[PDB]
Amino acid sequence: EVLYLKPLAGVYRSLKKQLE
């Protein structure tokens, strides 16, 4: 995870529909 690398990158991706 590295503090917030994976937490912000998964939450933001899925919401923007896998970041279209």
Swiss-Prot record:
<comment type="function">
    <text>By binding to host proinflammatory cytokine S100P may interfere with host immune responses.</text>
</comment>
<comment type="subunit">
    <text>Interacts with host proinflammatory cytokine S100P; the interaction blocks S100P inflammatory and chemotactic activities.</text>
</comment>
<protein>
    <recommendedName>
        <fullName>p33 subunit</fullName>
    </recommendedName>
</protein>
